[PDB]
Amino acid sequence: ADPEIVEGLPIPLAVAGHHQPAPFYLTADMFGGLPVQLAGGELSTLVGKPVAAPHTHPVDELYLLVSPNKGGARIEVQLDGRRHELLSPAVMRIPAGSEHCFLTLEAEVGSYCFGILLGDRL
Amino acid sequence: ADPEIVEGLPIPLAVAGHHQPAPFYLTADMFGGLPVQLAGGELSTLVGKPVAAPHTHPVDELYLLVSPNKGGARIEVQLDGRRHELLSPAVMRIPAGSEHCFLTLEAEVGSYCFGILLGDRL
């Protein structure tokens, strides 16, 4: 087993507000310790099916939205109780402590949203 | 214009070893300053077409490989002059200073590889 690689992905972690574990691709324990965590997933099966209720983390975060066609995915991010619209590709800042969640309004195969956590606590 | 969002993506930055600019989705200047940078892209048009010669960065890095079907993308990462194989989903550590690059061997629509730079210098 090659210590430079992790193939045991995603790592499903319990996360506040979620109805099933969130899929993690980077965790804080990896490779002797990372300064970020990263969760997310492909959106084609999540149209109209939010992964979570509004929830918080004690670290700043970023949402990253990508899709193979320009504008191929659209999400709504609730932040501080108000909706923001993202059209792929896009990034959005989510301040530490802020109540947030996203909803997929449209996606194609290969649309991805990731939550990038700028620290090691959830 | 909503300061919490960046829609002007990707941000094509000149990067050593590349033949065209690398597509950045997170840059160090964003949102008043980030501690990471992130570049990458969809792999279906990159099968057999490496983006770069071996090159280095002065910060630790991670490669993240995802695809809509489990095992739907396979890449080879050269690290320290030796090839490592990644089958999606996977992550690989790339130590600061280490000569590295990747080659897409197989991908489907929606396969993505990202380089996640654990610092603010290239």
Side-chain angles (χ1 to χ4, degrees):
Chain A
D2 184 338
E4 295 174 340
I5 303 166
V6 175
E7 293 279 357
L9 302 182
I11 299 149
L13 300 183
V15 173
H18 283 241
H19 46 93
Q20 64 184 138
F24 279 72
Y25 295 83
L26 295 178
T27 59
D29 58 290
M30 290 173 175
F31 306 129
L34 298 181
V36 294
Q37 308 195 279
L38 184 157
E42 202 263 10
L43 306 178
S44 72
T45 54
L46 295 177
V47 178
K49 303 180 187 297
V51 304
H55 58 112
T56 74
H57 293 298
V59 301
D60 290 345
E61 175 179 355
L62 306 163
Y63 277 123
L64 171 62
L65 178 67
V66 299
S67 204
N69 290 298
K70 187 178 180 42
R74 176 177 283 284
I75 73 177
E76 189 164 60
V77 175
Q78 280 201 37
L79 176 63
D80 298 329
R82 182 166 176 191
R83 297 283 202 168
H84 301 248
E85 291 274 336
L86 296 188
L87 180 64
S88 67
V91 176
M92 180 170 173
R93 78 183 294 169
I94 300 299
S98 64
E99 288 287 352
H100 64 280
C101 59
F102 79 100
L103 173 64
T104 310
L105 295 180
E106 181 53 301
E108 57 176 347
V109 163
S111 303
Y112 281 87
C113 181
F114 300 103
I116 304 170
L117 301 150
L118 298 180
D120 59 22
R121 299 168 60 227
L122 291 178
Chain B
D2 184 338
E4 295 174 340
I5 303 166
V6 175
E7 293 279 357
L9 302 182
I11 299 149
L13 300 183
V15 173
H18 283 241
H19 46 93
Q20 64 184 138
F24 279 72
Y25 295 83
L26 295 178
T27 59
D29 58 290
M30 290 173 175
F31 306 129
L34 298 181
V36 294
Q37 308 195 279
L38 184 157
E42 202 263 10
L43 306 178
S44 72
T45 54
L46 295 177
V47 178
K49 303 180 187 297
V51 304
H55 58 112
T56 74
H57 293 298
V59 301
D60 290 345
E61 175 179 355
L62 306 163
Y63 277 123
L64 171 62
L65 178 67
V66 299
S67 204
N69 290 298
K70 187 178 180 42
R74 176 177 283 284
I75 73 177
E76 189 164 60
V77 175
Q78 280 201 37
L79 176 63
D80 298 329
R82 182 166 176 191
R83 297 283 202 168
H84 301 248
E85 291 274 336
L86 296 188
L87 180 64
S88 67
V91 176
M92 180 170 173
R93 78 183 294 169
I94 300 299
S98 64
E99 288 287 352
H100 64 280
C101 59
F102 79 100
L103 173 64
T104 310
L105 295 180
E106 181 53 301
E108 57 176 347
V109 163
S111 303
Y112 281 87
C113 181
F114 300 103
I116 304 170
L117 301 150
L118 298 180
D120 59 22
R121 299 168 60 227
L122 291 178

